[PDB]
Design an enzyme around this catalytic site. Structure first.
Site, PDB file in Angstrom:
ATOM      1  N   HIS A  57       0.815  -1.220   0.000  1.00 47.46           N
ATOM      2  CA  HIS A  57       0.000   0.000   0.000  1.00 47.46           C
ATOM      3  C   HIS A  57       0.850   1.273   0.000  1.00 47.46           C
ATOM      4  O   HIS A  57       2.065   1.219  -0.174  1.00 47.46           O
ATOM      5  CB  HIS A  57      -0.890   0.025   1.234  1.00 47.46           C
ATOM      6  CG  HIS A  57      -1.960  -1.011   1.232  1.00 47.46           C
ATOM      7  ND1 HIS A  57      -1.824  -2.219   1.878  1.00 47.46           N
ATOM      8  CD2 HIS A  57      -3.195  -1.016   0.678  1.00 47.46           C
ATOM      9  CE1 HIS A  57      -2.929  -2.926   1.718  1.00 47.46           C
ATOM     10  NE2 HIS A  57      -3.775  -2.221   0.990  1.00 47.46           N
ATOM     11  N   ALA A  58       0.201   2.411   0.246  1.00 45.25           N
ATOM     12  CA  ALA A  58       0.849   3.722   0.184  1.00 45.25           C
ATOM     13  C   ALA A  58       1.991   3.876   1.157  1.00 45.25           C
ATOM     14  O   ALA A  58       3.013   4.420   0.776  1.00 45.25           O
ATOM     15  CB  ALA A  58      -0.154   4.852   0.377  1.00 45.25           C
TER      16      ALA A  58
END
Lengths: 87, 87
Positions: free
Chosen positions: A14-15
């Protein structure tokens, strides 16, 4: 130089971890690319990385709750099929 | 209401088709969520959709070309393993 990795994190990437990756790449002057889902991006650009999208073979789950939920699900189903995206 | 779709597009779903999807969702007042890669987002928010990331099981290909390419590949390999992301 080229190397292939298999992603092993339950969470995937993810980010937050993609941000750590992106900043490792930025420490270096070489051209660093990441190739995935038919796209090659700059590994130094988080907007590039966060633009790889959802891959072929993905299972996605859409939910709709509300007054026009049936109209919602039908529109979304129709868009995914019309655009040849998902079924 | 809940429905599961399999993604069939060779390209998968990138920003352009994800934008069309997102705008179909926005036409409706119900709460619409998309669940994928261990995350549930608002289907009306393209920043949400473009934040699902790279999934477990993905094969990614990193390339480095330049004066510090060996140092680059080694750093990136070390980060992917340290953070328990990819191998």
């Amino acid at each position: 130089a080229e190397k292939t990795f298999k992603v092993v994190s339950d969470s995937g990437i993810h980010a937050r971890p993609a941000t750590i990756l992106v900043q490792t790449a930025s420490k270096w002057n070489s051209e660093i690319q990441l190739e995935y889902n038919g796209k090659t991006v700059n590994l130094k650009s988080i907007m590039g990385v966060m633009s790889l999208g959802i891959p072929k073979g993905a299972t996605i789950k859409i939910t709709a709750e509300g007054a026009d939920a049936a109209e919602a699900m039908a529109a979304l189903t129709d868009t995914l099929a019309k655009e040849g995206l998902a079924e």
